[PDB]
Design a protein around this ligand. Sequence first.
Ligand code: XMP
Ligand code: XMP
Lengths: 296, 298
Amino acid sequence: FDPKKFIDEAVEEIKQQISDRKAIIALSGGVDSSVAAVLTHKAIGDKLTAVFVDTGLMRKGEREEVEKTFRDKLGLNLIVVDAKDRFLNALKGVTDPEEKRKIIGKLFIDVFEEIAEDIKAEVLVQGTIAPDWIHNVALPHGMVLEVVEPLRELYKDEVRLLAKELGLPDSIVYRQPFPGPGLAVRVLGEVTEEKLNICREANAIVEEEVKKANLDKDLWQYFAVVLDCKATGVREYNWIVALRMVKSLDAMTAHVPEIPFDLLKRISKRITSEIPNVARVVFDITDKPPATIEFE
Amino acid sequence: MFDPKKFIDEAVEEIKQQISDRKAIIALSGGVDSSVAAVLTHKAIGDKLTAVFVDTGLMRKGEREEVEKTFRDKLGLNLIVVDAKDRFLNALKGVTDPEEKRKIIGKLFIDVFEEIAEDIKAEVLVQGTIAPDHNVALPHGMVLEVVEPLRELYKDEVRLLAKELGLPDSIVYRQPFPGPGLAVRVLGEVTEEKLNICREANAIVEEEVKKANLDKDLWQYFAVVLDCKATGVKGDREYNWIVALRMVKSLDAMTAHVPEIPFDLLKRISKRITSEIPNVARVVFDITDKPPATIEFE
Ligand SMILES: O=c1[nH]c(=O)c2[nH+]cn([C@@H]3O[C@H](COP(=O)(O)O)[C@@H](O)[C@H]3O)c2[nH]1
Ligand SMILES: O=c1[nH]c(=O)c2[nH+]cn([C@@H]3O[C@H](COP(=O)(O)O)[C@@H](O)[C@H]3O)c2[nH]1
C-alpha cells in the first residue's frame, strides 16, 4: 500500500464524483471518518460541512479534540451540536440495551438530518471501510443524499497509514473503535449522570495507562464498564467497574491477551483512588466467542 | 517448638476429666479447628460425643460426603447429618440484604443444632476455638458447658496436631470458608439456579488451582455469582450471569492483595466455567486489593 499514491488518487476521484455540490460528513473522532473528512476537504474545501454531535456519551474531551483538530488546525466548516441534555433526558429510566440503542440511533440521525437540511447537503461522505458485505441513501425523514466512500476498499492498517501521512494527530491515527451509542452501552442498567461520570473517568484512566504501556497499537479495544451490581469495600456497597481489553482483527472474534499484571493493578488503583463510589475493579477474561466484546 | 504427641496425651486426659461421664455435642464445619477438637474429644469419651454436620446446601461441592467418609467411616465418631438444604433455601427466598442473609443463616443453623442438642440431652458443647494469631445458653434455654481443647493453640500448631491425628490434607490445608458458605458468594437473592452455578464454579476453581500447585501460595481462591448480566454470542446475543473469580494472598486480618496469577490458569478456569456451566455469559477476575475492597463480594 502506497499512502502517497492513494491520497493523490482519492482526492481526484472525490472532486470529480462530488463535482460542485455541497457535502456532509459525521465526525465521530475516529480514524475512518477523520481520514475521509480530511481527504474530502482537500478535494472540495468549504463545500464540505463536518458535523459533530455531542451526544454526552462520548469519551472525555472529544468535543474539544474535534474542534481543535478539524476547526482550529485544519479549517473545516464544522457544526457542533451540544445535544448532551437531550440524549440524557431521553435515556432517563431506560434499562433495556436494545431500547438504549434505538433511542440514541434515532435522536442522532434526526439531529443529523436537521443539519443536512439546514445546509442543503446533496452528498453524504462516509468513512466506510472494506468489505462491502455489511448509490443514494434515504435518511429516515426522507432526505436523499448521494453517498461517497473513499475508504470502501481499504482495511484497518491501510487507513492508519493514511491518517499518518495526512498529519492527523496520533490520538486519531490510533484511536480505538468506539460505538454509536458510546458510553451508554458501557453503563449497564440506567444511564444516570452518576454512573456516566464514573464510566467516563474510568475510561480515561484506561486509555491513558494503555497509551503509557505502548499497547494502544496492539489492542483492538480497551475500555471500562460500570456494572449494575455492587460489591463491598473498606462495609459499604458501591459500583463494580469491569475492564475490557481485547485483540481482534475485525470485531468478529476476539481474544483477551496476557495484559501485564502491573498495568491492570495500576489501573485498578487509579480507579478506586481517583473515582469516588467505585468499590471494586474486575477484568474480563472471556474470549469472543462465547462472549461479545461489549457487556450489553 | 510445639509437640503434637505430648499435647494429644495432655489434652485427651484434660477432656475426659472436664467432661466426665456426660454427653457432649460438637458442630462439624469441615474446617480444621472443629475437625481436630472432634477427634481429640472422640479419643477422650468415645461414643459419648455426638458430632453434628448440618448440610445447609451452602457448603462446597462434596462437603457432606467428605465429612461422612472421614468422621463416620474412617474415625468411627457418632455422626448425625441433618439434610437442611430445602430448609435453608426456603428461608433465603426473596432475601437480598447481605446482613439479613448472614442473620437468617446464623439463627437457623443454631435452631437445627439446638434441636439435636435437646433430642440427645447434651450437656457439654465442644468448640474448636483456637488462640487469636464458660457456659452458653441456647435459644430455648438449654444450657451447655463449653469445652475448648484448642483455646491456646495457634493455627500453625493446630495444623500440626491434625496431621498427627490422621486427618486428610483436604481438611488440614483447606482454605478458610465463611460460616454462611456460598450464600455470600451469590450476590442478591440466593436462587437454586445461581447457587448451582456458584457451587460448580467453585469446584472448577479449587481443582484448577490445585492442579497448577497454587493452593500453597494463595490464602483464598473462589468464585462469585454477581447479580448482573452480560451478553454472550450463541448463533444470532443472550443475557446471562457474570461469575467473578477472587484470588488473594493475605498475612493478616486487615489486608489482602491480588498476586500475579499465571494467565493460562485464569483462561483455563474461565473457559471451563463458560463451556461447562449453563447460563454463564462472562468470567471476570477481581483485581482489587484490601484496602480498599473486602475479600468477599458482600
Ligand atoms: O457503532 C456501534 N453500535 C453499537 O450498538 C455497537 N455494539 C457493539 N459495537 C462494536 O462492535 C463490535 C462487536 O461488538 P459485540 O461483540 O459487543 O457485539 C465491538 O467492536 C463493539 O464496540 C457497536 N458499534
Ligand atoms: O465465617 C465467616 N462468616 C462471614 O459472614 C464472613 N464474611 C467474610 N468472612 C471471611 O472473613 C475474612 C475477611 O472477610 P472480608 O475481607 O470479606 O471482610 C475472609 O477470609 C472471608 O472469607 C466470613 N467468615
